[PDB]
Every structure is written in C-alpha cells, then in structure tokens.
Design a protein around this nucleic acid. Structure first.
Ligand SMILES: [Mg+2]
Ligand SMILES: [Mg+2]
Ligand SMILES: [Mg+2]
Ligand SMILES: [Mg+2]
Ligand SMILES: [Mg+2]
Ligand SMILES: [Mg+2]
Ligand SMILES: [Mg+2]
Ligand SMILES: [Mg+2]
Ligand SMILES: [Mg+2]
Ligand SMILES: [Mg+2]
Ligand SMILES: [Mg+2]
Ligand SMILES: [Mg+2]
Ligand SMILES: [Mg+2]
Ligand SMILES: [Mg+2]
Ligand SMILES: [Mg+2]
Ligand SMILES: [Mg+2]
Ligand SMILES: [Mg+2]
Lengths: 65, 138, 258, 181, 50
RNA sequence: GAAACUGCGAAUGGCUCAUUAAAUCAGUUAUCGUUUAUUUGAUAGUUUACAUGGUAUAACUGUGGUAAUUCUAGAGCUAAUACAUGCUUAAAAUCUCGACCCUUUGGAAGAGAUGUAUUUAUUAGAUAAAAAAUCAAUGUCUUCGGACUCUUUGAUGAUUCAUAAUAACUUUUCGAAUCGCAUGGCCUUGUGCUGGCGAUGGUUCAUUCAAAUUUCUGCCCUAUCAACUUUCGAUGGUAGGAUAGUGGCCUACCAUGGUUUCAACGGGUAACGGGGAAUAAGGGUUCGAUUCCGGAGAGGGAGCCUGAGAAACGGCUACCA
C-alpha cells in the first residue's frame, strides 16, 4: 500500500526480477553486522509479497537442490 | 494536575506495560540521596514528575551541604534562601553581619514557607543561577 | 595556554628531587606514565643526581640507549620516564636492584635490595570493577590493571604483584593493626600501625597511625599504603624504619657517630 | 557566530558584564540541522576530539519499537502531526526528538499476523495457541492498524546521531496526545 | 611481492591471536573454579548458621 | 643519500600588562556533568589471500605565462603504514524458523542467527528477619507413592552505576593486504609444514599529561551614584536545537519573577591577581610591569580551515588605520 509501490497490473512483470534480486542479496555471507542486517531485511520483505510470490522465492531457493 | 503542559511528563525509561495490568498504580522510580537524608513518603507515593527532584529525578546530591532560611517562594519549584555569616575585620578586631542569597531547587514533595530552615545539597547546574537542591526541611 | 605544557621550571619542580636552583633554568619534566608528575622521580634525576653514575643528561641518554636500565623488569629508554613509589630499578651490568621508597625526610631514597626482593612489588588497590565481557579487574596505584582478581580484594587493600608475570601473589586487607607507610603530607615517609579509621561519608576519611615510639598522627586515607602486619613487612625498609625523630636528637646522634 | 559562553549574559543582579576574553573554540555552536522527510541526506561533522557527529538533513525511514510486545521494525515516516515545543515544526514537517509522527503500519501488522495468527503447519498452530493468551491489544492501537498509520514519538535526536528511531504511543501517552490532537 | 617474510608474518600473527584466545579461556575457567569453591563454602557456612 | 610523498611538531617556549572590580586570582570543592594526542597496563579464533585497484599523484622528463612573490598552467611518468577496497581460524552452547512422522507428556531432519562500534525500546542488576493453601503453565526424581536439598548476583554516602540480556537499526566503524634483524624445529625432501627477537598501527576500558565548567569565602575610591534588570532573556518551568557535555547558551509556549542601605546598579582607577618588598615596637600604611604560579594579547574589531589540543596570528579571510 505504499505510495511508490508497484501497481497491481505491473506486479506480474516486475516481481520476478525483484524476487531474483533479493535472492542474490540473500546469498551474501551474513558475516558482519551491516551484512547480517542485510540478510534480515531481505527475508522481512517476504510477508509484503503475495503468497504466490512468496512461493516462487522458495522454489528459487530449492531449484539448486 | 501533573499533565499540565504541552508535552507529557514521565519518568524516563520507566515503562508501564498495558498488557500485563498488574497494578492500578503506575510504576514509580525513586532513590535515596544518601548522607542519611530520608526520602519522604510523599515522593514515594506521590504522582508528580520532576526531573530535578533529588529522590525521583535524574540529579545526584554531591559536594557541600548548606543550611539557610527561606526568603522567597514566589517562583515555580524553586526558592531563594538567605545565609547569614560574620566576617572578621582585623584592623578593628570586630565582626560584621553579611548575607548571601542562594537560589535552590525545591522538589514538590516538600512544602516550604517563608521563614523555615532548609538544609540543601549541591548538585549539577540546574539553571542559570541554581546549583543547589533542597534535601531537608524544618 | 592553548594546549598541554612541555617545560618545567626548576623552581616549579618538586622540592624532593633536590635540584640545584642555579644549575640551569629548566628541570626534567616527567613524561606521562604510571605515576603522577609530583609523586614521581624521573630516571635522569635518579641516575645523575642520586647515583652520580652519569655527569650530564647526554650521558644518561647514552646509558639508556644501551638498554642497561630496567624498570619493573622492563627496559625503558626515556630519560624522563616517571619512576615512582615502590618501583624496582634494575642495573644488570652493575648488578644492583633498587626500590624507590621515601625516607623519613620525605625524599626518595637509594635503597638497595636483593634479587628475590626485586622479583616482586606492592600495589595499593585504587579501584575494583567489572570490565567488558563480565571480567573483574583491579587498578593499582601505578596504573596496572590485573584481571581476575581474588574476590576478597577490595579498595585500599594491597596486592603483591610478581613483576615477571604481572599477577597477584598475595594480598593484605585494610584493617586495624596493619603496618602502613605514609605517602603524602608532612608525615610523608613515616611508618606505623593503624589504630582507628574515622569515616566521613561524602568526605575524606582519616586514619590514626601509631609509630613504634608510641607517637600518634592522623592522616588522610589517600596517603596510607598498607605494607604488611606489625613487625613483618613484606618489603625491606630503608634505614630509620620510617620513624620520625626530633631535631635535638638529630644533633645528638650526628655528634655521637661523628 | 554561535557561542554558548555565559559571560555575554547579564549577571543575576542584572549588571552588564564587561568582555573578559575573545570567544574560545571550546564554547562554539553550530547551525541547527532541520531534518525533513525525504530521500536520505546525511553529512558528517567533525567535532571536538576525533569523534564525529551525523547530521540528518533528510530521512524518511526509522527503527520504531513496539514496547508492549518488545519488538522493533524499520518503517517509513508519513509526516509530523504534533510537536510540543513549537507548531511551526509541525507545519514545516521538521523531524526532532519528542515530535509526534505518523508511521506506516504494515510491518508491525505482518509481525502480529505471524506471531499470534490473528488479524487486526502444526508447529505454527502450536506456537499461536501457546501465545494466544497475549493476543489482545489496546483498542486505540488496533483502530490505527485498521487505518494503516500509527502514532509514534521520536526518541532519538536526528540532529546528533542521524537516526529517527522512536516508539509507538500507548495507554496514557496515546490518550493524552490524542486529546491534544 | 609475495615473499617468505610476509608469509611468516601472517603465520605469526595468526598464532599470536589463537594463543591469546586460549590463554583467556584458561584464565576464565580458573576464575570460575575459584568462584564456585568460595560460593560452596559460604553456602555451607550459611547452612551451619541455620 | 639530495628532492618529494608520508608521520609528528609547529597550540611548547619567549615577550607585554592593553582590557578586566566577584571578573581574574588565592585557598577550598565537584564532574553520578564532559573531551583527552601521547605514556603505561590490559584488551579482539565470530572479519585473489603464496596478498586487490587508480576509482593517482608528488618528486622527476618536457612545453610555458607574469615586472614582480615560499605564484604556478598543459602534457607525460611511478610508489606507500597515502587514498580506496577485501578474505582466509576451535568447539560448544543458546534462541528462532521449522520439512516430516504422529496425535503424543510428543518428537523432529534440517535452515538460519551470536564478536565489536552507533541509535532506539525493554529486561536483570535481590535482599530486617519465618512459616502455609490454592489457580495456570511446567521441569527434575524416585522406592509410582508423592518428593523436589546445597540453588546466582559486584561497587558507591547515593544513581537508570559497572556489567549483562532481548528486538531491530546504520551513506557506520574496528577486528593488521605494514616493516627491520636472524635462520631455529619437524618430517612423507617439498623453495612442504612450523617457528624466534623487535618496530609501527588498531577497538574499548583504566592510568598519566591536560582541558572545560563548577561549590564556599575573600577585592581600592565613590551615596552630591537609590533603586536596578525585564520591548532586543532579566528570574524560573516545560519541550526542542546546539554543545564533548550541565546550563536562557539559543529557540517556542508559559508564568513574574531576580538584586538592594548587610550599599544593588552606575561612575573612577596611572586595577593583570597572588607568592612577595619596604617600613613599624605593636597595631597598621604603602609598593608588587619585573626571575615562580595563574589569566589576557599579538595595531583595532569580526570570522574561520587544520589538528587531540587554536578562535593561533613568526596559520588564513574581511573591514578600519
Ligand atoms: Mg567522593
Ligand atoms: Mg605533511
Ligand atoms: Mg591598565
Ligand atoms: Mg565599573
Ligand atoms: Mg566567585
Ligand atoms: Mg609522539
Ligand atoms: Mg596502548
Ligand atoms: Mg598531470
Ligand atoms: Mg534541556
Ligand atoms: Mg524567547
Ligand atoms: Mg596594584
Ligand atoms: Mg606582579
Ligand atoms: Mg593567544
Ligand atoms: Mg606595536
Ligand atoms: Mg586571531
Ligand atoms: Mg613577530
Ligand atoms: Mg605565536
């Protein structure tokens, strides 16, 4: 519901890039206090996503396996 | 009425949890100043908020302890006491009455009238001229 | 002044160093270190004006850069290093160990000690407090911080520090009947036994000390240094055993030995 | 130009003091930093000693702490609603300590959904049931959650630390400030 | 330039830090034992007083 | 080993007494009200590596401007303990999220997180002394009945103190890409592994040199100076800003306060203060720019970069002469 938030019509196209970007940020070695805070943030934005979009991120995590 | 100003008055870092609701009375923090100075039960069970109160505020009593006579109480939460002493003149081998007026912060836990004897303790600078704080009344 | 001073006039120097007032215009300024400026003896004064081993400052520097002087088992090369009370000064080439202890007159005295005595020093416990990660530590009078102290050790106690390892070997509590050494006031350098400790909350505590001659004197607690139990000091004492003696008798025994 | 020296003031007796010495660096003062909502602009200030201070010229996010549940989240700042010292800061949307502000309600709402499973896996059900007794909250907070904007108070000094942390008003705090609003 | 001296310095630095950590652990353990012994004996004395 | 970069110093010292009448200064207090280069002591297994870049330049080569200066323009080069980046090292414990089995009194593979620094919110930091009954959750144990002991807490006269814990936060730090001398020990014989004495840096704490403010008392002449301060802060309260930090230091809103014949306020001073000097029998009177301590200044006002430290002046910038 943010003012600058992605519109629902455009949510389909942008979201895969957003999800994959956050995936790369999630793979940073969470090793220093700034870096650890970065990993916490990327997981904390998941509830903002709709459940179908939460699901695909989990699929991306499991694709390598 | 405690909450008589634009901002809320609260003891800093003293948190009352609405969820637990253990006691009706709001949690109140207090300390004993030392030097055998008794914390009045009014401060313990009172409802005022004063950051400069020696028993409930963020101020410590350290250094000289003086005594004086209240001379003025017309301002808010502070008074002006008078200390009288005798100064020695050697040439005439004789004394002279001299007096000095000291402004002292008084916590609302005390009720002081013009004429009573008050013992005060030094603290950090509270205002432009206030460097003392009332700690005992009589 | 717009910053810290770096010069010390001879007249403004501590009296107990006993410096000539006409030799020059400036005196050695003790650098920052374990002891305070007014309660410290710079190595230059000790090597030149006390031991007479060096004739001038340059020769003192030459000795120091040769690394022959050790303070508390550590080599020091600063001319103005502030050695102080209960400090051990070791000269290996000459084979001496000195302990800096005030005489009765109130001046640091050249007191020679044995090696086994030079292996340890004493420290008055100035502070005890928990450091980071919940590790207790004690700060002594010479700026030494020792971690993991014995819990019984408190402020005003004395700790026997082994120089090689810098750890507490034994300690003495501050109690009546203990042997004490005065490190300030006009009673500086005297030795006695505690009688009573008068306390004033929010003020300076006062201690009554009785000498071997039964004379009594009162001194502020900050100038008292516990050195052992009565008759059993943990360090070798200088000549006179910290007993103040009058002037007439001073004439007397000077004549007698003369 | 700004100095904190007390000599320039009149004496308590009202005498006009004479000018003892020229101003010293160790009673200096610096221009106020009127922090305002917007894209982050912070610039460092070299202060006395080697220490450094942060000046928040602009900031729009802050770490706010919900005290009742003992949680804290980062949240965007909506706008300043009330300030006790002076209303001109409210008008100009200047961020300072003790300023009452409005913050977004989404992250707290997500956290409460997840933690209690109520709205404002078996393991999830077990945890929710165990914590079910504490689910109830103040009605005033829940109404704001419905609205989506929560009232908060800034407990940090943006002009010093460069942060706009704060806490969510509750109980008598919230009632008093609502009355003032 | 990669030279044996740099390798030696790195290795010495690592060994120093590791040895420091081990020494601190040993000292902490000894302090813990001393505290436990004092705590036990004072508790025994309190039991005797009762 | 010239030159230059880098680091440190230049805020010390020396000089003068213009301003300054509770100001400075003397004695005596306080920082539980704050900064502190350096010395000294502690203190960091949690962070392509047989070791990263120009996101770069001086000195230097060469081409030039100006009458003139410790003036410098263009182009070409190359370094770091400069500048900017960036890993590599034990185990355990605890706390979350939890696939799945199973409906238990449940269990649980796994996936995460934890050093330090900053900011916020919350929690612990006990106690003058002794015994019981229940509601809820719920853990050890036996002789299945009920039982359940020795249970952890420092300092101060006093604190929201020291310290620790939980949840997040950061244009966010630190956690050695440095250097000298020497060539010891293990072997699976590899320029394999390991290893000595020092220098220089680095987080935090303490100490030291210091700084800042501060509590009480104490200054010459003048009453033919009697009321002063408050519109433009004077006294105090609340909140904020700023400060290294307290504080009308400043801002906004509030009240009307504050000093005074025990001389306020104003005026004079050829007034820097003191340790001291002279005189005197004692009381006193006078001197003290001048070998030491403390304060202020660099022709006069105003404003600043750097740095731990300056409102610096043998540092810079205006205005006045
Ligand atoms: Mg004290
Ligand atoms: Mg340079
Ligand atoms: Mg003059
Ligand atoms: Mg005047
Ligand atoms: Mg004064
Ligand atoms: Mg140096
Ligand atoms: Mg060090
Ligand atoms: Mg070029
Ligand atoms: Mg304030
Ligand atoms: Mg105003
Ligand atoms: Mg004079
Ligand atoms: Mg003079
Ligand atoms: Mg100057
Ligand atoms: Mg001139
Ligand atoms: Mg100037
Ligand atoms: Mg000149
Ligand atoms: Mg100069």
């Amino acid at each position: 519901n943010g003012s600058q938030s992605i519109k629902a019509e455009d949510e389909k196209v942008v979201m895969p890039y957003v999800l994959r970007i956050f995936f790369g940020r999630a793979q940073v070695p969470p090793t220093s206090g700034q870096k650890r805070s970065r990993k916490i943030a990327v997981i904390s934005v998941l509830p903002n996503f709709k459940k179908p979009y939460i699901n695909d991120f989990l699929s991306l995590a499991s694709e390598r396996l | 009425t405690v909450q008589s100003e634009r901002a809320f008055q609260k003891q800093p870092h003293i948190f009352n949890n609405p969820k637990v609701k253990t006691s009706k009375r709001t949690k109140r923090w207090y300390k004993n100043a030392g030097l055998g100075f008794k914390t009045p039960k009014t401060a313990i069970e009172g409802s005022y908020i004063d950051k400069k109160c020696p028993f409930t505020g963020l101020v410590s009593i350290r250094g000289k302890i003086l005594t004086g006579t209240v001379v003025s109480t017309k301002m808010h939460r502070t008074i002006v006491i008078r200390r009288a002493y005798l100064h020695y003149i050697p040439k005439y081998n004789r004394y002279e009455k001299r007096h000095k007026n000291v402004p002292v912060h008084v916590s609302p836990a005390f009720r002081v009238q013009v004429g009573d004897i008050v013992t005060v303790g030094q603290c950090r600078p509270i205002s432009k001229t206030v460097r003392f704080n009332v700690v005992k009344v009589s | 002044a717009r910053g810290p001073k770096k010069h010390l006039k001879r007249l403004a120097a501590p009296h107990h160093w006993l410096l000539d007032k006409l030799s020059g215009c400036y005196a050695p300024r003790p650098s920052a270190g374990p002891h305070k400026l007014r309660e410290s003896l710079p190595l230059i004064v000790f090597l030149r004006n006390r031991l007479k081993y060096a004739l001038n400052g340059r020769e003192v520097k030459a000795i120091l850069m040769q690394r022959h002087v050790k303070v508390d088992g550590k080599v020091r090369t600063d001319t103005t290093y502030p050695a102080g009370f209960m400090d051990v000064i070791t000269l290996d080439a000459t084979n001496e160990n000195f302990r800096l202890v005030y005489d009765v007159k109130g001046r640091f005295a050249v007191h020679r000690i044995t090696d086994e005595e030079a292996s340890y020093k004493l420290g008055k416990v100035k502070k005890v407090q928990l450091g980071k990660k919940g590790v207790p530590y004690v700060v002594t009078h010479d700026g030494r911080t020792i971690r993991y102290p014995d819990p019984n050790i408190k402020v005003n106690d004395t700790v026997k520090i082994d120089l090689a390892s810098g750890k507490i070997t034994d300690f003495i509590k501050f109690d009546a009947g203990k042997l004490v050494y005065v490190t300030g006031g006009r009673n500086l350098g005297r030795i006695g036994t505690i009688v009573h400790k008068e306390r004033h909350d929010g003020g300076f505590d006062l201690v009554h000390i009785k000498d071997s001659l039964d004379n009594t004197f009162v001194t502020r607690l900050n100038n008292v240094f516990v050195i052992g139990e009565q008759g059993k000091p943990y360090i070798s004492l200088p000549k006179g055993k910290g007993i103040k003696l009058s002037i007439a008798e001073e004439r007397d025994r000077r004549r007698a030995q003369q | 130009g700004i100095s904190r020296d007390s000599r320039h003031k009149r004496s308590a007796t009202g005498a006009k003091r004479a000018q003892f010495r020229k101003k010293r660096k160790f009673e200096l003062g610096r221009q106020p930093a009127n922090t305002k909502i917007g894209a982050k602009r912070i610039h460092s200030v070299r202060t006395r000693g080697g220490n450094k201070k942060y000046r928040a010229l602009r900031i729009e996010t802050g770490n706010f702490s919900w005290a009742s549940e003992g949680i804290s989240k980062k949240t965007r700042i909506a706008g300043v609603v009330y300030h006790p010292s002076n209303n001109e800061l409210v008008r100009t949307n200047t961020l300072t300590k003790a300023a009452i502000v409005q913050i977004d309600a989404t992250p707290f709402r997500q956290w409460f959904e997840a933690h209690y499973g109520q709205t404002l896996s078996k393991n999830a059900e077990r945890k929710w049931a165990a914590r079910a007794a504490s689910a109830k909250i103040e009605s005033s907070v829940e109404s704001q959650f419905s609205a989506g904007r929560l009232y908060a108070c800034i407990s940090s000094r943006p002009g010093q630390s460069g942060r706009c942390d704060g806490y969510i008003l509750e109980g008598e705090e919230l009632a008093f400030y609502l009355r003032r609003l | 330039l990669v030279t044996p001296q740099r390798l030696q310095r790195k290795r010495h630095q690592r060994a120093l830090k590791v040895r420091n950590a081990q020494a601190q652990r040993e000292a902490a353990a000894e302090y813990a034992q001393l505290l436990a012994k004092r705590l036990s004996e004072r508790k025994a004395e309190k039991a005797e007083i009762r």
